[PDB]
Design an enzyme around this catalytic site. Structure first.
Site, PDB file in Angstrom:
ATOM      1  N   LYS B 154       0.808  -1.221   0.000  1.00  0.00           N
ATOM      2  CA  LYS B 154       0.000   0.000   0.000  1.00  0.00           C
ATOM      3  C   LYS B 154       0.838   1.267   0.000  1.00  0.00           C
ATOM      4  CE  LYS B 154      -1.654  -1.333   3.815  1.00  0.00           C
ATOM      5  NZ  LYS B 154      -1.571  -2.687   4.397  1.00  0.00           N
ATOM      6  N   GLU B 180      -0.467   5.630  11.131  1.00  0.00           N
ATOM      7  CA  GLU B 180       0.640   4.823  10.594  1.00  0.00           C
ATOM      8  C   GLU B 180       1.932   5.013  11.333  1.00  0.00           C
ATOM      9  OE1 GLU B 180       0.826   2.164   8.401  1.00  0.00           O
ATOM     10  OE2 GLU B 180      -1.323   1.961   8.887  1.00  0.00           O
ATOM     11  N   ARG B 181       3.062   4.675  10.702  1.00  0.00           N
ATOM     12  CA  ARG B 181       4.335   4.765  11.434  1.00  0.00           C
ATOM     13  C   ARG B 181       4.901   6.164  11.492  1.00  0.00           C
ATOM     14  NH1 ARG B 181       3.930   0.076   8.415  1.00  0.00           N
ATOM     15  NH2 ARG B 181       4.843  -1.838   9.287  1.00  0.00           N
TER      16      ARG B 181
END
EC number: 7.1.2.2
Lengths: 45, 466
Positions: B154, B180-181
């Site tokens: 993704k 997310e990260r």
């Protein structure tokens, strides 16, 4: 059958010749040949 | 108005007011704290009490603590001065570059554009990615979604698209990192700086960044999307601008919702999700759209839990997209990247009257042969190819060559493919696929087609393979 491509191979090369060629007449030893390179060439047995 | 903290459970803070109960969605500021702690009202429990969702960790709060009605919903700096800046759910800069000095402020909760405000122009957006362009083409001002289980592609696909599309886009872009990260935000920011889309010297930045990552409490992750969203809405309507909106990952917003939902005291729906899942996706997804005033091309990464696309989250998201790129672990594991499932990706533009019949016929051509290969697979699986018909074996050959030709090296994934990234032009894709279909390469080996751009490179690779 159930031996990979044993029959299809000879048949494949068999059709190839009959095409490239001079009169044509054929013989098949082993029912499989008579069922494979067949219909198209029964009137050629 | 000043209320008092009555109860605290994780991110659900219940506050009681004596005079003047704040309406739902209003942001309250907790008093007596080293940093800002915004509470968003969620409902009136009656008895002058309001149940709210904290926007940051709630440790340290104390029952009886004072809370102040801000008088409005979370509001954030909107305008061109957000371009090149990194901001919070609650709109504060987090790039250590000072205050975002804007003329106006916008509230993160708005209604979706009306029916009469909708648009119906359908323009293809070429990306240079073979599979996408050929089979499920994106569209300007359209809504795109990349579905993917963990570690399937993704983000790499969003990056490559940012590279191939965002980089040469006249107009702005908004990247919203949701759940997310953090390292990724950092990887991107610095990269954006480097290629100059973010300029810390001049006012020439073309990207505004909003982040609420994997380390935030649920409520933050539940609202950052709204925040990135709002920034984008400003450029669309207040400047009639053509926007690009990237979100990684919108699945995280829904997950965040499921995290607080029990705390709000709701009977869960299926799979433990909140009964309000669809409406929550809905009033949010419906603002991410092109209108008569402005265009929003939005690309959203959609994380699929346990790889299950029947999961309420992803399942409910299909209906909001115009084009979908469904990534597959099975394909990825074969080494095909991007791991796009060709029989599962779609696009409302795959219409002869829009992509032309040449395009429409190669596209359906490729799918038909892969669908056919797909049904032979069960038997191929126990007995291999031997017993296959000469005819069937030709679909198989072609299908395996089409399957390989659908893969391609991304600049962004050069460190892993070991190959130089390629960008293939649409006509090159339509073509290369025609020929394959048409039997013009039945002599080449499969491996010739793997990891290449244009067909011309597939022929070459074949020579090198000798």
């Amino acid at each position: 059958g159930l031996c990979g491509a044993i029959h299809s191979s000879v048949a494949k090369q068999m059709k190839s010749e009959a095409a490239n060629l001079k009169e044509v007449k054929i013989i098949g030893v082993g029912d499989k040949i008579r069922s494979i390179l067949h219909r198209t060439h029964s009137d050629q047995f | 108005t000043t209320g008092r903290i009555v109860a605290v459970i994780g991110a659900v803070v219940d506050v009681q007011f004596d005079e003047g109960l704040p309406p739902i969605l209003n942001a309250l500021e907790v008093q007596g704290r080293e940093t800002r702690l915004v509470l968003e009202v969620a409902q009136h429990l009656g008895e002058s009490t309001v149940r709210t969702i904290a926007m940051d960790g709630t440790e340290g709060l104390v029952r009886g603590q004072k809370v102040l009605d801000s008088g409005a919903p979370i509001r954030i700096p909107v305008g061109p001065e957000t371009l090149g800046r990194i901001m919070n759910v609650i709109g504060e800069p987090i790039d250590e570059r000072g205050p975002i000095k804007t003329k106006q402020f916008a509230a993160i909760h708005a209604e979706a554009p009306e029916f009469v405000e909708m648009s119906v122009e359908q323009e293809i957006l070429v990306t240079g990615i073979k599979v996408v362009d050929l089979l499920a083409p994106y569209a300007k001002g359209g809504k795109i979604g990349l579905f993917g289980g963990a570690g399937v592609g993704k983000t790499v696909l969003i990056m490559e698209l940012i590279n191939n599309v965002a980089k040469a886009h006249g107009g702005y872009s908004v990247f919203a990192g949701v759940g997310e990260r953090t390292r990724e935000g950092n990887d991107l920011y610095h990269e954006m700086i480097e290629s100059g889309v973010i300029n810390l010297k001049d006012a020439t930045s073309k990207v505004a960044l909003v982040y609420g990552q994997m380390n935030e409490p649920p409520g933050a992750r539940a609202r950052v999307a709204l925040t990135g969203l709002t920034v984008a809405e400003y450029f669309r309507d207040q400047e009639g601008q053509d926007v690009l909106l990237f979100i990684d990952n919108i699945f995280r917003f829904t997950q965040a919702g499921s995290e607080v939902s029990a705390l709000l005291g709701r009977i869960p729906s299926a799979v433990g999700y909140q009964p309000t899942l669809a409406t929550d996706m809905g009033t949010m997804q419906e603002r991410i759209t092109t209108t008569k005033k402005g265009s929003i091309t939005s690309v959203q990464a959609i994380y699929v839990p346990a790889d299950d696309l029947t999961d309420p989250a992803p399942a409910t998201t299909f209906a909001h997209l115009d084009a979908t790129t469904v990534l597959s672990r099975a394909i990825a594991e074969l080494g095909i990247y991007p791991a796009v499932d060709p029989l599962d990706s779609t696009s409302r533009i795959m219409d002869p009257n829009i992509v032309g019949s040449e395009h429409y016929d190669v596209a359906r051509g490729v799918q038909k042969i892969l669908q056919d290969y797909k049904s032979l697979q069960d038997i191929i699986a126990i007995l291999g190819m031997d017993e296959l018909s000469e005819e069937d074996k030709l679909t198989v050959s072609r299908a395996r060559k089409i399957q390989r030709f659908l893969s391609q090296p991304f600049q962004v994934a050069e460190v892993f493919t070991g190959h130089l990234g390629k960008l293939v032009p649409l006509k090159e894709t339509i073509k290369g696929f025609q020929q394959i279909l048409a039997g013009e390469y039945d002599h080449l080996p499969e491996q010739a087609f793997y990891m290449v751009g244009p067909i011309e490179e597939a022929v070459a690779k074949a020579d090198k393979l000798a």
